[PDB]
């Protein structure tokens, strides 16, 4: 109660981000970089959308 | 039976996948090159295969 | 789906489902080296290259990087040998609109190519 209304979702985005961290420490333990991986794993119809909220 | 594209949500029918085929960090022979990029008078000693030209 | 049908089912069916999956855009780079090595296994690598081809299609940068170095390992190694001329294009395509650090890398892999089969000069 004495901590932010928000803090437990802050806390659940924090560890969202961590989890995030993790996949990113796991393609590290596997030898490839995560930013490689995701590139791998993103499907292009994500960055469609983003282009058109640019637009 | 044999898997390779999902990620299963049980680990016993995680272990069934196909061990994917791990990339190559091609920068790592691009280095090669990168130690042919010192910046040096290449002419290091009087060597007439750099000084006069090959067929 | 895709796993249970190449497990399971006949080469035919799997690889509708990657037809599919292609066509409502689904497939990431990932399921496209799964598929073309898939294709491998069934031994019709210029339908492997047409999927390699396909992927880069629908795909833009970072990440059609990473589906050439993998779509070029594959074709030097066999067909590289057989017909070069076609290779030489395709890094003319590989190269158009390239971010510099995955630029690099392709000119000199082009360059070396041109060492190891083509003119000097080029």
């Not at chain 1, 961590?18 to 791998?40: F, P, Q, T």
């Not at chain 3, 070029?72 to 067909?79: C, G, S």
Request: proline share 5%; with cysteine.
């Amino acid at each position: 109660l004495k901590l932010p209304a928000n803090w437990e979702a802050k806390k659940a985005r924090l560890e969202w981000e961590l989890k995030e961290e993790e996949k990113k420490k796991e393609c590290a333990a596997r030898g490839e970089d995560y930013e490689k991986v995701k590139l791998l794993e993103i499907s292009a119809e994500d960055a469609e959308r983003w282009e058109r909220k640019k637009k | 039976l044999r898997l390779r594209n999902y990620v299963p949500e049980d680990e016993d029918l995680k272990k069934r996948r196909v061990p994917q085929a791990k990339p190559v960090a091609v920068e790592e022979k691009v280095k090669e090159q990168l130690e042919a990029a010192k910046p040096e008078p290449v002419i290091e000693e009087v060597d007439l295969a750099n000084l006069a030209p090959r067929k | 789906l895709a796993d249970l049908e190449e497990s399971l089912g006949t080469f035919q069916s799997t690889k509708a489902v990657y037809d599919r999956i292609l066509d409502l855009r689904i497939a990431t780079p990932q399921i496209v080296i799964n598929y073309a090595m898939f294709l491998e296994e069934h031994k019709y690598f210029e339908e492997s290259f047409k999927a390699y081809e396909r992927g880069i299609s629908l795909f833009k940068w970072p990440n059609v990087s990473d589906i050439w170095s993998t779509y070029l390992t594959k074709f030097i190694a066999r067909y590289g040998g057989r017909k070069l001329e076609r290779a030489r294009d395709l890094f003319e395509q590989a190269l158009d609109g390239c971010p510099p650090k995955y630029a690099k890398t392709l000119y000199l892999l082009y360059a070396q190519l041109e060492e190891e089969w083509g003119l000097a000069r080029h």
